[PDB]
């Protein structure tokens, strides 16, 4: 079959399953494209790993994300994690890893939640 | 693609394509006299006969953005600056024109006086931003300077 790679994202009770395969440069979430994210103010939070990396690095990859659980804010944060993990897991497997290293550095210089999700764990004093 | 037409207490925005009523502005106590768009096209004036002028955003009757209280006389013409895009010039039946910066919508930046009777149309001049043409209702077409003290025509 075609090359593929699969990552996971996690906010409070919302999970994201993103599959990244070689293709025509199309971006899909739940069948719908990315220009139809319903919270409508957080739509720039899911374009956010797209525009930090430059749109040329998504021109030949495909992204298909399912999301279940959570609400609205927790769902959008799951999509931006799974896209950013899905891009950086494709590039560590079939593309240059120095490309992966510059892709990873461009995310952790911005924000750590795009790569791994900090579990907001309780603490007793 | 739009033009504003004034009426009894209702400035309605039309269309150039459909030539039909897009929106209506029905937030007026007395009759609205003038309605001039700015050169940016975002914000349109509405001079009201009750005394105070209201300027808000185009294509939005809901958000009354600004309501400057002029003198208690009715305001016949409220025009925006052509080269500048932040200063409103209004007239009144109080025989004075006022130049309001919309940052300070409570005190007039330059109370342009010296008119004889009933200034009802004024205009700007595209070369010089300091020069404001002002027309009264007895002849005597005033030409005013706002870089100067601005209380007597050149």
């Amino acid at each position: 079959a075609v090359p593929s790679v699969q990552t996971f994202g996690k906010k409070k009770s919302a999970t994201a399953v993103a599959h990244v395969k070689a293709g025509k440069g199309l971006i899909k979430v739940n069948g719908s494209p990315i220009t139809l994210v319903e919270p409508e103010i957080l739509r720039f939070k899911v374009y956010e790993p797209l525009l930090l990396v430059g749109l040329d690095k998504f021109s030949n990859i495909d992204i298909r994300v399912r999301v279940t659980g959570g609400g609205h804010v927790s769902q959008v944060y799951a999509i931006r994690q799974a896209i950013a993990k899905g891009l950086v897991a494709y590039h560590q497997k079939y593309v240059d890893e120095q490309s992966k290293n510059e892709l990873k550095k461009a995310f952790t210089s911005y924000d750590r939640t795009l790569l791994i999700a900090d579990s907001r764990r309780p603490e007793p004093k | 693609h739009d033009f504003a037409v004034t009426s009894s207490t209702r400035v309605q925005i039309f269309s150039s394509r459909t030539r039909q009523v897009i929106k209506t502005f029905s937030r007026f106590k007395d009759v609205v006299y003038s309605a001039s768009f700015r050169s940016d096209g975002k914000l349109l004036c509405a001079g009201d006969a009750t005394g105070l002028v209201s300027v808000y955003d185009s294509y939005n009757p809901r958000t009354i953005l600004l309501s400057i209280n002029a003198s208690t006389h009715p305001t016949h013409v409220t025009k925006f600056h052509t080269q500048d895009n932040k200063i409103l010039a209004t007239a009144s039946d109080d025989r004075v024109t006022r130049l309001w910066d919309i940052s300070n919508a409570y005190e007039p930046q330059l109370e342009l006086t010296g008119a004889t009777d009933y200034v009802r149309t004024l205009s700007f001049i595209p070369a010089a931003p300091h020069l404001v043409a002002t027309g009264s209702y007895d002849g005597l077409i005033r030409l005013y300077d706002t870089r100067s003290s601005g209380s007597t025509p050149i």
């Binding site: - | 009894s8 207490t9 209702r10 209506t24 029905s26 106590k29």
Partner: protein, 113 residues
Amino acid sequence: SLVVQEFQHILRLLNTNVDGNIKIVYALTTIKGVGRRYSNLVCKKADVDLHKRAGELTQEELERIVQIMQNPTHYKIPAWFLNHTLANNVESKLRDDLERLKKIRXXXXXXXX
């Protein structure tokens, strides 16, 4: 330099004092017994403009609207847009109920006594 033109203050329509500042599709809503959507029906039956104030719309046709109002049955207008001591006995007949129950029970006899 003359122009030929064509307003008034508050008006009465069968003892209903209505202001002349808002348009008639919501001005008639202050009249008792009149619904909101009933006003949009009765205005278009009376051949007026819905976004138009009550200061205009002259009194010869203002009386024409209010006669549509007072006789709704004959102008083919449907009428479905339109509209104690029994608590005194029932508690007092349970007051003696709790009073005799305090008499019946040999414990409940110390309210304000």
